[PDB]
Amino acid sequence: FQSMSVGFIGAGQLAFALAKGFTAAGVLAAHKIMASSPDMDLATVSALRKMGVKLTPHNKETVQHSDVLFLAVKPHIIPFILDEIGADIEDRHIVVSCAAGVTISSIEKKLSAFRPAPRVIRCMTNTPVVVREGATVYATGTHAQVEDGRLMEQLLSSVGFCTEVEEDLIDAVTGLSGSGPAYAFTALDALADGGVKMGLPRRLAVRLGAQALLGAAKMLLHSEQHPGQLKDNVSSPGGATIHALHVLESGGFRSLLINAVEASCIRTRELQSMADQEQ
Amino acid sequence: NLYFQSMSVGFIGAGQLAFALAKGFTAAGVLAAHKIMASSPDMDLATVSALRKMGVKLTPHNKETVQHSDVLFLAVKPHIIPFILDEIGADIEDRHIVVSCAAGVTISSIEKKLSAFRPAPRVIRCMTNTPVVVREGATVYATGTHAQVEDGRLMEQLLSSVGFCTEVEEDLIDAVTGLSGSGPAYAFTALDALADGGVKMGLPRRLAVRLGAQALLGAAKMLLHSEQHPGQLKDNVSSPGGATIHALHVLESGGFRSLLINAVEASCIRTRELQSMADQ
Amino acid sequence: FQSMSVGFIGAGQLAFALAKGFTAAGVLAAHKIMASSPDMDLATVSALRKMGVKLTPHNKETVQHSDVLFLAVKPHIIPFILDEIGADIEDRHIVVSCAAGVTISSIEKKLSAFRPAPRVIRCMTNTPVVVREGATVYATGTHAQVEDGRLMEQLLSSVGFCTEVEEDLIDAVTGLSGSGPAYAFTALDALADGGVKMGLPRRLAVRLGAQALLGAAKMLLHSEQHPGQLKDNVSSPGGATIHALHVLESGGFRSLLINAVEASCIRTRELQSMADQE
Amino acid sequence: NLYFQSMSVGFIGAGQLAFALAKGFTAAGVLAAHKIMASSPDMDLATVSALRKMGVKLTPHNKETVQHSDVLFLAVKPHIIPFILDEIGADIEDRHIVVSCAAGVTISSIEKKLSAFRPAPRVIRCMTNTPVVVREGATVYATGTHAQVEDGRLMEQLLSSVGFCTEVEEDLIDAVTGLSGSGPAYAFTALDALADGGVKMGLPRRLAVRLGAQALLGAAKMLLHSEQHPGQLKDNVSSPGGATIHALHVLESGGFRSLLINAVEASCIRTRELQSMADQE
Ligand SMILES: NC(=O)C1=CN([C@@H]2O[C@H](COP(=O)(O)OP(=O)(O)OC[C@H]3O[C@@H](n4cnc5c(N)ncnc54)[C@H](O)[C@@H]3O)[C@@H](O)[C@H]2O)C=CC1
Ligand SMILES: NC(=O)C1=CN([C@@H]2O[C@H](COP(=O)(O)OP(=O)(O)OC[C@H]3O[C@@H](n4cnc5c(N)ncnc54)[C@H](O)[C@@H]3O)[C@@H](O)[C@H]2O)C=CC1
Ligand SMILES: NC(=O)C1=CN([C@@H]2O[C@H](COP(=O)(O)OP(=O)(O)OC[C@H]3O[C@@H](n4cnc5c(N)ncnc54)[C@H](O)[C@@H]3O)[C@@H](O)[C@H]2O)C=CC1
Ligand SMILES: NC(=O)C1=CN([C@@H]2O[C@H](COP(=O)(O)OP(=O)(O)OC[C@H]3O[C@@H](n4cnc5c(N)ncnc54)[C@H](O)[C@@H]3O)[C@@H](O)[C@H]2O)C=CC1
Ligand SMILES: O=C(O)C1SCCS1
Ligand SMILES: O=C(O)C1SCCS1
Ligand SMILES: O=C(O)C1SCCS1
Ligand SMILES: O=C(O)C1SCCS1
Secondary structure (H helix, E strand, C coil): CCCCCEEEECCCHHHHHHHHHHHHCCCCCHHHEEEECCCCCCHHHHHHHHHCCEEECCHHHHHHHCCEEEECCCHHHHHHHHHHHHHHCCCCCEEEECCCCCCHHHHHHHHHCCCCCCEEEEEECCHHHHHCCEEEEEEECCCCCHHHHHHHHHHHHCCEEEEECCHHHHHHHHHHHHCHHHHHHHHHHHHHHHHHHCCCCHHHHHHHHHHHHHHHHHHHHCCCCCHHHHHHHHCCCCCHHHHHHHHHHHCCHHHHHHHHHHHHHHHHHHHHHHHHHHC | CCCCCCCCEEEECCCHHHHHHHHHHHHHCCCCHHHEEEECCCCCCHHHHHHHHHCCEEECCHHHHHHHCCEEEECCCHHHHHHHHHHHHHHCCCCCEEEECCCCCCHHHHHHHHHCCCCCCEEEEEECCHHHHHCCEEEEEEECCCCCHHHHHHHHHHHHCCEEEEECCHHHHHHHHHHHHCHHHHHHHHHHHHHHHHHHCCCCHHHHHHHHHHHHHHHHHHHHCCCCCHHHHHHHHCCCCCHHHHHHHHHHHCCHHHHHHHHHHHHHHHHHHHHHHHHC | CCCCCEEEECCCHHHHHHHHHHHHHCCCCHHHEEEECCCCCCHHHHHHHHCCCEEECCHHHHHHHCCEEEECCCHHHHHHHHHHHHHHCCCCCEEEECCCCCCHHHHHHHHHCCCCCCEEEEEECCHHHHHCCEEEEEEECCCCCHHHHHHHHHHHHCCEEEEECCHHHHHHHHHHHHCHHHHHHHHHHHHHHHHHHCCCCHHHHHHHHHHHHHHHHHHHHCCCCCHHHHHHHHCCCCCHHHHHHHHHHHCCHHHHHHHHHHHHHHHHHHHHHHHHHC | CHHHCCCCEEEECCCHHHHHHHHHHHHCCCCCHHHEEEECCCCCCHHHHHHHHHCCEEECCHHHHHHHCCEEEECCCHHHHHHHHHHHHHHCCCCCEEEECCCCCCHHHHHHHHHCCCCCCEEEEEECCHHHHHCCEEEEEEECCCCCHHHHHHHHHHHHCCEEEEECCHHHHHHHHHHHHCHHHHHHHHHHHHHHHHHHCCCCHHHHHHHHHHHHHHHHHHHHHCCCCHHHHHHHHCCCCCHHHHHHHHHHHCCHHHHHHHHHHHHHHHHHHHHHHHHHC
């Protein structure tokens, strides 16, 4: 009953996932969302159009429509966008940057040249908001009101987990839960290949592997136990599971997942350093 | 609005799986805890103490469980199954459906033991996993020689209340064991390691565990609810030149995919090997 | 393109591949093509002569002859070429650089010293244009007219896939489809060795492996499905294919192909940095 | 072409291969979809749906497919073949050509089953692949003891309509399985990974997939049309000091060639071992 108007600058995968999640949650009407993109011939744009989201090529129209304005363009596009519509940001706006790596400081520096106290929030979310099981963190900017952070948390909690963090954690969150779903999709493809190798039909192997991962993740979320203790409860002495865990260990399975989180976090920091030098 | 008002369930064995299934069934509301009985020779077990708190009836005597129950879950270690069947075989009656949850143990071996006492024992073999405790298990089952059509439908109805459940041919169950039976342990290992990675890059451990588990849960749900290939969903996360595709490369460089294939294979092979030792 | 005259500065592998492709496509007459090289005794020069292309040692003759001018020399030779013929570029010319790494900016700066508004196109293609199955991208320069891009796409679409890109994608394209045929030739040699190890005659193993790769690539191009889904359709449970896919995975096969695209792209960027520093 | 004038074709099994062959045969125009019949127990498959839309006649009864067809393709999983041969063996007649597509299954095992019913079953063993669906398959076949001369000629003409086809001795078919039978899956894996490499270096995924597939198709076509060795063609791409030779080094450092040899070998060996388990049983 808030009747919030939401805009997305950028009408790609994340704008679609968030719009789909918000509308499935019943927090927003699809036609109260407006998204802009210069390439109005993407599949994401077509899917947004079918949902009933309003679409325009003009970023200024998205700004003027919006109360909450999500920045959902590639990180290197954010400064061009802030130059373009910075004069259109109003005191009523909450600007939510979803761009990987882009700092609140960089955004406020651009926008403060126009109005003195732009309300900026930075978030890192992930594509599972599309099924309302996202993992979201956010940090509040210099001029964001206490009510702004609470509004953001309410909105993003409707599509998954949401919590406030200090901004200096967000690049690490990006490497864990931002990139996380891609590690899981890779793992599920491989587990299914394993099931197929041992004689299962592919359709059944995909379903079983995905259900196994979902159930295990839910167990851990609902348990106060260490993941190692939960692992111990699966493995009977001499049994099949502990034999399988040994071959994972012999390949350095754990180290590969640590490598992945690190690589994603470092690349996030490295891109932003490139961005800050280009300014 | 499901409820089996005339069904008494028993567990021979009162360990991790018996607890998980009993907790799942009671949370589902399809069974009252007092209609469940579990037996174990060790009544000083953490799982036994937990089943007590739920209201499950406990006894040291497997014969008591058999006499109380209609649906009888065998939830003991695989090498104990033949001793259990020798012990209570004379107590199996026409009304009993015997559901073996033991990894690897064949319908054939169970029916041969029980048929020495009374012909036509109704046997079902199932492979489930511990997430039935949060009603997100993955279960397959195969029906035995003398199981009636209504027996398998009833068991699918019961096991569907605590997660995914489908009928399979028995010769797929050892492979299912390697995938979704052992799968939760692969996930717990992966979540421990992902959290270590989060901590390495500066996150508090509690938050890293929560975010990693939420990421895995959400991705699995996305795939279950999508008609798209996991590779296509992966492509939607990875923007060109971005952080995710850099991370995917280092996974590939370590043969990440091959390790998970190795694991499913190793668990399946061990399951087959253990049963061959049992039958020899 | 009946009135169109095409020239190649540099008469080596790529010039032959494009001229053979163009003439087999019927979009160009061989006698309307001229190519120049210093060493008129190269094997590519002789093959070009056999198909009816006009040949000359003088790059200025090529320029005076043609409307569309392909630069098909090694990348470090481009600046020397642009200095030699810059004064002969006219308003009618479309200069198409095929050189790996070389930027539109560097070409326009050299040519603009002689005449303002040179019409420049940068492209990255590959050798399979010789069988009209090339993969080509192009970027239009500052002063290229809109019809210039449409003309180049029409011409290069006759010898394979062709699409316009932003210039900052071209170094990555170079690592993928520019170098890609070499990855495929390596893979085909190895697959044939595998067939021979298992008892096939070499000639048959080469033919079968190449047919397999061609068919699979065509399947993917004509399908809406993800390559992973097509892989799923081949491998039956417990079967020979999924066993072989495992051994590829155990060697990090996917990671090696990622390494290759990366290494070729990085080397391309590195070489242009040395050119721009010089 | 009088071979196909009035010929009817049947598929026992209605999965990926049956759809790929039926699609290729009809696209080639060598066969009308209504002259093709397929049978499968579970009509709940996706491939059974597509075959319906093509105009292919479907039925659950394998005996009906046998009665309809002159050329009978066996397109079921290898371990089902002896069960199928028990079921329809008394229905195989003199006029049938039985074409086994099952991996590993020997002409000998098929002829042993069918010869218990009628003395001279005409059997052909083939190994094809899924790109017949785009008429670019790679097919080999071996002729059985009782296959007539025109039988192999008929088979060759039919399978040549959807790609390369040549006759081989049967002892080569397990190795062909490891090379061109499994080969498309190696290519699909390689294209997925090449596209990941394009994406890592900044390309949109859609363009990376298109460029990688076009590169592989073009290189394969080049080799098929050239008399030159693959290494000489590789040499023509690599300029001294250039990007390609740098990329080839990193492939070599990972043993890229050996992985592909490993794959052909592993598929060939699994094919041999599947059959040895079948004939022991
Ligand atoms: N996809 C994911 O998994 C997640 C993405 N993100 C972040 O969200 C942002 C976008 O992510 P995707 O949606 O995956 O990118 P995407 O590339 O799918 O969509 C990007 C959109 O930006 C549009 N665009 C380009 N220039 C524009 C301009 N000048 N004005 C307006 N729109 C313009 C493009 O047309 C495209 O529609 C990135 O910053 C990424 O870091 C963060 C968390 C997860
Ligand atoms: N824990 C898991 O992840 C799953 C286990 N299973 C199967 O379930 C069965 C049990 O698994 P867990 O519960 O993990 O074992 P567990 O070891 O936690 O509990 C085993 C129970 O058997 C009891 N027991 C030993 N001898 C007995 C006897 N003579 N009579 C009665 N009870 C006796 C023990 O006291 C204990 O309560 C095994 O066969 C295993 O393969 C299958 C799927 C998943
Ligand atoms: N071979 C390939 O796979 C592809 C090559 N390219 C690019 O095309 C260009 C050439 O490729 P290749 O034809 O393989 O080189 P190549 O070395 O086969 O032929 C190069 C030609 O340049 C000639 N040349 C040298 N100095 C000259 C001068 N001062 N004036 C006129 N001609 C001169 C040489 O005599 C030779 O004929 C390079 O820039 C390369 O990056 C791009 C894509 C694919
Ligand atoms: N898909 C491929 O890449 C190629 C497959 N092959 C061979 O072709 C055969 C099947 O290939 P796919 O089509 O991939 O198998 P698939 O499993 O996709 O379809 C197999 C068909 O057999 C049917 N079937 C099972 N039992 C049956 C019965 N009793 N009567 C009639 N139909 C029955 C199934 O319903 C299914 O339609 C296998 O032997 C395989 O080795 C060989 C070359 C390539
Ligand atoms: O504990 C074990 O190893 C068996 S029970 C879970 C899957 S296999
Ligand atoms: O493009 C990317 O990889 C960013 S968006 C998802 C997490 S990081
Ligand atoms: O699917 C399989 O593994 C067999 S059928 C294609 C070649 S081998
Ligand atoms: O020869 C080379 O390495 C360059 S030109 C073709 C791809 S990159």
